[PDB]
Design an enzyme around this catalytic site. Structure first.
Site, PDB file in Angstrom:
ATOM      1  N   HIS B  43       0.804  -1.220   0.000  1.00  0.00           N
ATOM      2  CA  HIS B  43       0.000   0.000   0.000  1.00  0.00           C
ATOM      3  C   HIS B  43       0.834   1.265   0.000  1.00  0.00           C
ATOM      4  CE1 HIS B  43       0.296   0.064   4.539  1.00  0.00           C
ATOM      5  NE2 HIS B  43       0.115   1.362   4.411  1.00  0.00           N
ATOM      6  N   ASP B  92      -0.704  -7.361   1.208  1.00  0.00           N
ATOM      7  CA  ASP B  92       0.042  -6.116   1.427  1.00  0.00           C
ATOM      8  C   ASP B  92       1.551  -6.393   1.690  1.00  0.00           C
ATOM      9  OD1 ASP B  92       0.269  -3.373   1.695  1.00  0.00           O
ATOM     10  OD2 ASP B  92      -0.361  -3.354   3.795  1.00  0.00           O
ATOM     11  N   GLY B 191       2.484   5.679   9.232  1.00  0.00           N
ATOM     12  CA  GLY B 191       3.881   6.005   9.012  1.00  0.00           C
ATOM     13  C   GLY B 191       4.778   4.842   9.392  1.00  0.00           C
ATOM     14  N   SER B 193       3.830   1.737   8.714  1.00  0.00           N
ATOM     15  CA  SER B 193       3.551   0.723   7.722  1.00  0.00           C
ATOM     16  C   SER B 193       4.811   0.300   6.998  1.00  0.00           C
ATOM     17  CB  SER B 193       2.522   1.224   6.710  1.00  0.00           C
ATOM     18  OG  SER B 193       1.289   1.436   7.346  1.00  0.00           O
TER      19      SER B 193
END
Lengths: 7, 242
Positions: B43, B92, B191, B193
């Protein structure tokens, strides 16, 4: 190697 | 990181900071898995930046203050999972290749080191304590990322408690794992991620999950969701190409 850190 | 503590990069030497040219902008975290490869979240690349716009920094405690032993790298190319679902966040996971003049990119130091990938048949007991790291926000309503790396300690939630019903009917697939604080609750936040969720497994920190998503940051009984890495070992291998 991998996964060792400053303990 | 919501809750948690300020940390030193030496305690999490596999943590990568990914920047995008705006002028730079902090994009997401990453995880060093090999000398030239880093894992991150699919993502994070929705805006589709060309490789030459991305920079990967290793060995930095402060988000924007250069560390003395940091290693900056350009991105050769990156691979986002073909079946990443932009709506549910299923699949993801991404791979980023570092640019270099040989088959060796990052070099080991006290501040740069790889995490170990998990054994395909890795299964930990419910509530195992694990930890995470990132330069992301401290709270969801915060308009700034962290100035310094932070760490949090969460526990793996039972699969039975990692369901849509538990995540306010937000879709949860088998490729996801939940972990949270079982009690300022610790949690990943925007942030963070692409960063790591690692657990001690035989004296080595082992990658268990990639910080993916969540509802807010640190709400009681609402766990964070992570990409279940053991499900992607074959994909990591097939995709680690020069």
């Amino acid at each position: 190697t991998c996964g060792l850190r400053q303990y | 990181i919501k809750g948690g503590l300020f940390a030193d990069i030496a305690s999490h030497p596999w943590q990568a900071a990914i920047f995008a040219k705006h002028g730079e902008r902090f994009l997401c975290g990453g995880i060093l898995i090999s000398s030239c490869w880093i894992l991150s979240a699919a993502h994070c690349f929705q805006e589709r930046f060309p490789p030459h716009h991305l920079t990967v920094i290793l060995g930095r405690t402060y988000r924007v203050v250069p560390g003395e032993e940091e290693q900056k790298f350009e991105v050769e190319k990156y691979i986002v999972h073909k079946e990443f679902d932009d709506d549910t966040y299923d699949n993801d996971i991404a791979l980023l290749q570092l640019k270099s003049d040989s088959s060796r990119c990052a070099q080991e130091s006290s501040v740069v080191r790889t995490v170990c990938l998990p054994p395909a048949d890795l299964q930990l007991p419910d509530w195992t304590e694990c930890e995470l790291s990132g330069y992301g926000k401290h709270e969801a309503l915060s308009p700034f990322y962290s100035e310094r790396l932070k760490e949090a300690h969460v526990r793996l939630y039972p699969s039975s408690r990692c369901t849509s019903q538990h995540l306010l009917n937000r879709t949860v697939t088998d490729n996801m794992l939940c972990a949270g604080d079982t009690r300022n609750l610790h949690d990943a936040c925007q942030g963070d991620s692409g960063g790591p969720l690692v657990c001690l497994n035989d004296g080595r920190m082992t990658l268990v999950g990639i910080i993916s998503w969540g509802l807010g940051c640190g709400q009681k009984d609402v766990p964070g969701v992570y990409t279940k890495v053991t499900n992607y070992l074959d994909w990591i291998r097939d995709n680690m190409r020069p």
